[PDB]
RNA sequence: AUAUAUGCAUAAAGACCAGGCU
């Protein structure tokens, strides 16, 4: 579901060149600070007081 | 078509999608008797266009 | 071999210079004529040799 | 003694890089 199982070149590039599937997408990147804030608000304990 | 007689065996017959490829005989035919030669080795050059 | 392969000939003291047939003249663009890699390398070697001589004197 | 020359009717780029062809 991420790359085409059938489409690939022949020769030295066989299997090393892929084509994305129709529904496939690539992540852009989001800040991780809201994730850390949500985790801390939902009771995550830090590594400083790890016993 | 030659005689108008019935064919003994029936023929699978129907429309089908076909596509023309970029591989034409007039773009690949090549012949050479005598022509340009390389400066260094004095051997015939490489390339259909360059004779 | 005494007659053909003498050991001290393995060390280079004089360098042969091949004719321009070995290193044919090249032309980068029309009238301007370039030089092959061998021509430039021989020029650099000769420049180094004349530098050695002129700094030795 | 001739006379100036004031003129030129083919030269062959090759080496690398990338993408394809069976």
From TrEMBL, chain A:
Q: Which residues form a coiled coil?
A: none
Q: Where are the bilayer-spanning segments?
A: none
Record's subcellular location:
Nucleus
According to its UniProt entry, the function of this protein is described as:
DNA-dependent RNA polymerase catalyzes the transcription of DNA into RNA using the four ribonucleoside triphosphates as substrates.
The UniProt entry's sequence similarity note says: Belongs to the RNA polymerase beta chain family.
Quaternary structure per UniProt?
Component of the RNA polymerase II (Pol II) complex consisting of 12 subunits.
What is the official name of this protein in its record?
DNA-directed RNA polymerase subunit beta
Say which species the protein is native to.
Komagataella phaffii (strain GS115 / ATCC 20864)
Residues of the whole record sequence present: 513 to 563 of 1227
TrEMBL record, chain C:
Quick one: signal sequence residues?
none
Q: Which organism is it from?
A: Komagataella phaffii (strain GS115 / ATCC 20864) (Yeast)
Q: In which domain of life is the source organism classified?
A: Eukaryota
Q: What does this protein do?
A: DNA-dependent RNA polymerase catalyzes the transcription of DNA into RNA using the four ribonucleoside triphosphates as substrates.
Q: Which family does it belong to?
A: Belongs to the RNA polymerase beta' chain family.
As for subcellular location, the record says: Nucleus
Q: What is this protein called?
A: DNA-directed RNA polymerase subunit
């Amino acid at each position: 579901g991420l790359v085409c199982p059938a489409e690939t070149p022949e020769g030295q590039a066989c299997g090393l060149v892929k084509n994305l599937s129709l529904l496939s997408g690539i992540s852009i990147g989001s800040p991780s600070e809201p994730i850390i804030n949500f985790l801390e608000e939902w009771g995550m304990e830090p590594l400083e007081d790890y016993d | 078509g030659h005689t108008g007689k019935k064919l003994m065996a029936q023929v699978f017959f129907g429309p089908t999608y076909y596509q023309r490829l970029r591989h034409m005989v007039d773009d690949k035919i090549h012949a050479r008797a005598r022509g340009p030669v390389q400066v260094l080795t004095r051997q015939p050059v490489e390339g259909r266009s360059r004779d | 071999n005494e007659d053909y392969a003498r050991p001290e000939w393995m060390i280079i003291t004089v360098l042969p210079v091949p004719p321009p047939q070995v290193r044919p003249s090249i032309a980068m663009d029309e009238t301007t004529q370039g030089q092959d890699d061998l021509t430039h390398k021989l020029s650099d070697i000769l420049k180094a040799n004349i530098n050695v001589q002129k700094l030795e004197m």
